[PDB]
Design a protein around this ligand. Sequence first.
Ligand code: NAG
Ligand code: NAG
Ligand code: NAG
Lengths: 144, 144, 310, 310, 141, 141, 146, 146, 261, 261
Amino acid sequence: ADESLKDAIKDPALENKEHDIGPREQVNFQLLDKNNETQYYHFFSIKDPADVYYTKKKAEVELDINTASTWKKFEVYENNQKLPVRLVSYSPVPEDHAYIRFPVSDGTQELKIVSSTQIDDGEETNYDYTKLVFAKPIYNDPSL
Amino acid sequence: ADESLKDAIKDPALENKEHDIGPREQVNFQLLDKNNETQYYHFFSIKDPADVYYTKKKAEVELDINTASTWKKFEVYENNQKLPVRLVSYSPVPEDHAYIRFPVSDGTQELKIVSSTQIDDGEETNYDYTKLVFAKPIYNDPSL
Amino acid sequence: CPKPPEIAHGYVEHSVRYQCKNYYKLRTEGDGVYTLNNEKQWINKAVGDKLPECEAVCGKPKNPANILGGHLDAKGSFPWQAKMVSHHNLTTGATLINEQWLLTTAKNLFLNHSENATAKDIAPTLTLYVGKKQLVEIEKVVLHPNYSQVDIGLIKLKQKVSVNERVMPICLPSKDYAEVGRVGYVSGWGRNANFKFTDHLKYVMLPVADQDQCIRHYEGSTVPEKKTPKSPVGVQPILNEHTFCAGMSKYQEDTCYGDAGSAFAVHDLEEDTWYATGILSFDKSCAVAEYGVYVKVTSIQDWVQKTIAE
Amino acid sequence: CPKPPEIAHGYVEHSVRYQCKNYYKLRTEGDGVYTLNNEKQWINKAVGDKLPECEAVCGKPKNPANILGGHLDAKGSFPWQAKMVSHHNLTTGATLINEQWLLTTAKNLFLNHSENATAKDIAPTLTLYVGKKQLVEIEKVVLHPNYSQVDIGLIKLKQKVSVNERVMPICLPSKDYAEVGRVGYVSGWGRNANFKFTDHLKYVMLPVADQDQCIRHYEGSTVPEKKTPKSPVGVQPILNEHTFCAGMSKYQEDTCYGDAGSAFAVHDLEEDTWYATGILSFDKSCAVAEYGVYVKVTSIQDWVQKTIAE
Amino acid sequence: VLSPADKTNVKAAWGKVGAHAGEYGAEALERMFLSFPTTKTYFPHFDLSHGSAQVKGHGKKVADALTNAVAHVDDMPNALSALSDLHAHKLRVDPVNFKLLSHCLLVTLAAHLPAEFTPAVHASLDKFLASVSTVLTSKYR
Amino acid sequence: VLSPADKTNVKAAWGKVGAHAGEYGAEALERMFLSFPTTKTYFPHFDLSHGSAQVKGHGKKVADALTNAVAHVDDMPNALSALSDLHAHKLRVDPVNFKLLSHCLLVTLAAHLPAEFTPAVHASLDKFLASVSTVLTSKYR
Amino acid sequence: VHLTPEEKSAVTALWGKVNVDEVGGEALGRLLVVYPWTQRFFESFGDLSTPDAVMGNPKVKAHGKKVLGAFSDGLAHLDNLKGTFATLSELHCDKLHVDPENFRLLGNVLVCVLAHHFGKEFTPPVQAAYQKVVAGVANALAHKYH
Amino acid sequence: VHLTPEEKSAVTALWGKVNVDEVGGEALGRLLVVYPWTQRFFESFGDLSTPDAVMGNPKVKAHGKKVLGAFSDGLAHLDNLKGTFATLSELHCDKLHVDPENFRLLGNVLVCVLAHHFGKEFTPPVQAAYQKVVAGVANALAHKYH
Amino acid sequence: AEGLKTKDEVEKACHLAQQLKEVSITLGVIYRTTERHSVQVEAHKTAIDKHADAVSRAVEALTRVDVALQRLKELGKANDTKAVKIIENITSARENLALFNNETQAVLTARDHVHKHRAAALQGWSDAKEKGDAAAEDVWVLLNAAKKGNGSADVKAAAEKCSRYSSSSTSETELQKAIDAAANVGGLSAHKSKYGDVLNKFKLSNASVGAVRDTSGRGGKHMEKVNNVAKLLKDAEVSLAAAAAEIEEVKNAHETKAQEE
Amino acid sequence: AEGLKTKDEVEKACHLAQQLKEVSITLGVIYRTTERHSVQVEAHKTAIDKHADAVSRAVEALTRVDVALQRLKELGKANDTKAVKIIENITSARENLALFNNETQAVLTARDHVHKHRAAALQGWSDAKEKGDAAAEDVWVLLNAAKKGNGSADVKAAAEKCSRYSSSSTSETELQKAIDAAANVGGLSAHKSKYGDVLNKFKLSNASVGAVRDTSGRGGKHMEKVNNVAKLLKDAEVSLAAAAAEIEEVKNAHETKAQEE
Ligand SMILES: *[C@@H]1O[C@H](CO)[C@@H](O)[C@H](O)[C@H]1NC(C)=O
Ligand SMILES: *[C@@H]1O[C@H](CO)[C@@H](O)[C@H](O)[C@H]1NC(C)=O
Ligand SMILES: *[C@@H]1O[C@H](CO)[C@@H](O)[C@H](O)[C@H]1NC(C)=O
């Protein structure tokens, strides 16, 4: 799923599928590079605030990313270990938004994003480190 | 022959036949009626002088008569007995002259003509007595 | 053009169609129409620049019919008939063969003139008439080279004469109707049974007569060694292979002094045209002499055509 | 008539043949020829006294072929194209449907005017242009009863305009080429990539586009309950069964502000005639919005015919 | 044209004229000068009055001409030949004039001979003077 | 028309602009008033001189409008809606003027960012200001 | 034309003796016989071929009478000859187209028949007077021809 | 148009530093890429589809040079702009029928490429001076259109 | 019987008299209109005679081959070579001779017919002269009675204006149209059964005139066919002359035979 | 190599340069003359796609009757009544479908051809720009040499009067006529084998332009035939729909059979 995101959105089962069912929190975040200034490409590509959906086990953050067709590698790390990222809905080409979810452990605030963007067959632009900072910690609420 | 003269000229054998062969005398005559004045119809109808042709036996007078087609009875008498009149030549219709011959006894001068003229089927005009007087007597001359 | 009206945003292309007036005819190849140019030229797509000309019809009198004897000319059924008078008031016939010319006899021409006289002498002498009183003037006169055998003249009129119902030429025949069984029409200005020159043109139908019967009548013969002057009037007609004889009428009408030069005109019923089959030579016969005699026109053909050229 | 010459004894029968000048045509039954009378009347043996009239051709430009993008109009290949400017110097399109009338859009008409405004209000406001600078004056204006649905006006010109190579009406189609697979030609006076009103008439070829793809583009839908304003520029085109959409160019040329009222003109190669298949309604699309959209002319047919009658 | 029939009639009728042939000839001329005064211009020096010896004698000539004609009627132009030329050429008599005298000769014969003047004869008598009056004229020019 | 490719380029390029987005906005305007003096007639009361605080701040607004646009580039007309009406209706800005500033914004980005101004970006950057400069104008009337 | 009183007197007195049931018809049938082409106008009569048929044919004398009468009218008014025959002139010239020469031809055959009945009593002066008459008639009868 | 001496001086001095074997061709190839409809006139070059092909295609810079030169001639004589391009105006307007809007479109892509090579040194006053130039050129080049 | 009426019925009677008189005139001009055909058919006779003599030599010759094909009805009817090949060269000769005695006879019958019709023409004329002259005379005693007939005095004027002859000829048409105007008003006449005659003799007469133009026309057709085929015989006269005399040795089929028995 | 001659041969060349230059122009206008056909054949593709989906339902149905005529290749190939009378109502259905996959393929081949020719058009253009621009350039070094070339001095005048571009377009005609006047006089050029190229690439190029008008024309013919027969299928869609489903009981000839064995 997170090895190639623009291949991922090619699955027809995912188009305009519903991701909005259930209880959710809205948490604004910041997206910063390794000098702690905004990562402007990611800043621009991901919707702020972020829908966080409640589950039985851990809260699952949902990310809203445009130009999904030009996104390639999107890896999200919590305490430097890989989260199992998966694609839930995609919105076709005048829209070109991909919708992804991953579990986060109660208490998490910072998140690591290893990403890359490539147009068609061209130059792949690797984005080494992107720090995602929720404006407040994330806590699951199974009570809903 | 002398019963009907206009029937006589109808014989085709007689047309423009030669009557002029041989020796001949020319004798002037007069034609008179019973009062001894000229018979003007006969006067006009018969050529004067008259060719008289010489033969072995008696001289034969030849008479030249126009309008033969309107002549009917032409009888010629010598001493009140009938002469055998015959037609020798005829000259066709712009001409209409008949040529007749009869023998006369040597010494004859006067001659009797009983004649008639009829046009087609119409009125027959009888000419009872016509006296023909030769200006000199007729004598045959077998010596030629 | 009593000018055509204009239409909005449109133009006119002019044509004329030439047509010949009454008693005349179109001559050209030459369908007759002529279209105006951008060159403002009048152009027939067949003959181009060349106009047609109008040529008189012949043998088509406007009122057709339907000399001792009869047939007063009520209508003017004989528009080709000309009355020519010699210097001394002697009336004589001539017929109009086209717009400028009339046939006649050498004889009529020679009246009041010596055998010495030539054409130049005779032409000013004559007075000529067409139609009613119509006086046509007279330019030259020309005689057939065989005048003493073929008795024929030609008259040239100073100008052309206007053709109409009363004045109009007769057709020269391609065919020759000189044969017995044909019938003909003779007009005439000649004398009548009071031996007066006639007051009114008259005409008579006559059959054409067997040429040998006619010969045997006038001379005695056929064969020339047996020829003698048998002619009922004083004078002998001219008789050869260029002549033919017409009989007497049904009613014993005949053609007398003055009637020479009048045409023996045979009407062809199939093509409804009037041809001049002959011209009258011997007009002396009258009561007394069984055949008037004509010179076949077919036999003077190549000569008349030849003369017309001058 | 530069009068024909006379011929001897002959007369002339006059004819004229009427012909319509360049870029016009004969209307009548009515073989066109007219012969002069003895009544000196001009008479066609079919229609008699009635003249023909000359009617403008449509769909035959004198110099044919063969907006952000290209195709400068070198020749004047679009003689039916009119440039109309509203009161406040806003340039807008209209196309010439016959000698007196031009189609346009309700919208172009309503510029610098209230929804309140009626036709009488709007007509004096406008300035209209054909051909080069040619200023045609403007009598009335009439709007389609469905103006808010069918976006269409009609302009009546005070008089008829003279047709020629640069000024001439377009044909209204019997057939309807609104289908995909057809190609069309749009002329225009509208803006270009400097968003300047263009200095020279230009034109572009555009395919006609699938109606559903176009719908789904501008609204979200097909089905009306899922309809939302998806339009790439700020404003929504009018989309119904009386409209059709034309795609973008081969080279991404497209049709921008001012290009409404310009005709989507489809050239029919078999009959070599130029039909107006549609009129441009939505000229807003430009770079950013995939389809300019036209109202099918076949659908306003019976209305335009009806209006012309007054 | 003088058929056999005509020829017969003329002879038979002119016979019945007889010795009066002379006297008729004069009576005939007289009528002509009285009826048609223009014919007198051919006879300037003649005394033209009633029964003038000059008229009376001249009639005997004309009479005899005629008798001659019926004498050989089957050839008139030979018989009348010397007369052809006399009237035609020397005297130049207008052919209309013969038809006058023709008719006076017909009026004259009528008066003196009622019984022979049957229509049939009137025919052939007229033909006969036609035939003659022609032969004198046909050399006119 | 802004394909995924374009969209990526505009973000990636406008990112590399960063906090200077404000300062370019003003540099861009300045060029416009200097290059095309007619655009000054829309800004009467502004001090238009060099580095004028009024110019400099206004550029921060224009900068931000643009950043907004790339922030939601997948719907521009909703984002720019309140600006649609401002220029179209209230301010009535002649649509030619946007194409000037469009270009000045292109000249400006060129100067400050040589490495990203590859032809491919020059394309989508122009489309982007096209797409925007359209949306403001399409409510013109 | 003018006529001396003793001409007119010799004329009228003779005309008195003229049989009006015969003479005219005899003048007509002789014309048919002598100038056979006039037969053309009259063949409606019956057989006109022989002279006996003509002279005998009852429509001929029947006709002659009317003609003879027509001549009587002439002797009646000799000063207006034109007028008396003015209508008759129309019948022959305008409707019929008789050639005017046959009027005189007929007037003469009349004078012949006159001389036939009246013998020596038809005298050269009397003919010469009648000649004036059958002329004046023939002309007047011919007047509508011009 | 008129140009202040320090405008022309800043202009010419900058034009000095302009690489004449490259810039012109780069201006042209961007035009092909940014406003693709101009490709229509040049497709004789080779592949014009991708931006790399265009920028790489040897006939393009080859061409740009001649164009760039054509612009050098402008800066040379700025008073007779009409005349200098008078013939060039004929090639595009009378023979070719290029829409005059693509002259300015190209003059601008040139100014873009200018600003690309010269960075901060291509100053608002210098652009403003060059703006006068790529206009004057575009117009003069369009003069034979009227 | 009493004549008169208004100034109309005087005219109606005036026009009748004029047409009634004019029938005897018009029908005359018409008979003479046909003299042409009479004399023409006569000359056809003349020429038909002439032709009979013209071809006499050629028929006398073709007769000889008929009479020599008789004594040849013994040994000659069968394939005599030089004999049976003669009928092969007489092929067209006997064709024309067949046409001759055919077509000549036609112009002879055409001839006979044209006289008869011209006679019926003639007869009809003479009758309608009587009937017409009679009738016109009757309606002239009313017309003259109206002269001083106690008058309508515009009726008086309406007589003396009247003249004896019509100004023109008469159709069958004009005539009936004169009887027509006469019948209805002013049955004063009531003679109409006699006017029936003058018209019926009229009709009958014209009928026959037309008959001769028609019947003489087809005569001239036939005559033309006569003249032509007669030339074929006269020019083939020499041919036929030696054709009958070429049956010479066919007579030797007699002479060399008839002696020996 | 040496250029010059009289004041004639300067302009015999001047005209060459002008035509030689103008080949790279004219050939351009002509390529663009064919954009129409390129975009037209493209929209044909668009529509051909659209039709394939338009008739999809009707082909899927007619396929069902093919695949149900297969298990029918056991008891169904022989006179099944309600089956064998189906092919009677599918008579025209399979007619059109035959025409469809025929005519669609034609506009596809027409399509492919129009591009290739337009490519050969294109190739030819680019060459003749080189060859021509080259050549024109050469005969301009003689033309510029004649400017101050020691001169005939009326030759001098005859250069500066000369201008770079022709006033007009170029036929193949005009071109050869420029090479013509150039060959004979002033073999001074003697380059004529290269002018041969620019003309031969010219000819070759125009050849292909004409090829597309011709080949695109017959495309539009075929496309029209496509649109029509596609309507027959879309409107017979309902027909065919129940036609394949009427083979229902033909499947009972399977079901009622295949169980019992
Ligand atoms: C038309 O334009 C003028 C220009 O000043 C403006 O003032 C006016 O309000 C406009 N009217 C409408 C109805 O748009
Ligand atoms: C009968 O004669 C009249 C003139 O009297 C004419 O109208 C008609 O045609 C003639 N014949 C026929 C058959 O009508
Ligand atoms: C090639 O184009 C020229 C015009 O440049 C034309 O004369 C010629 O006809 C064209 N070729 C053919 C095969 O038509």
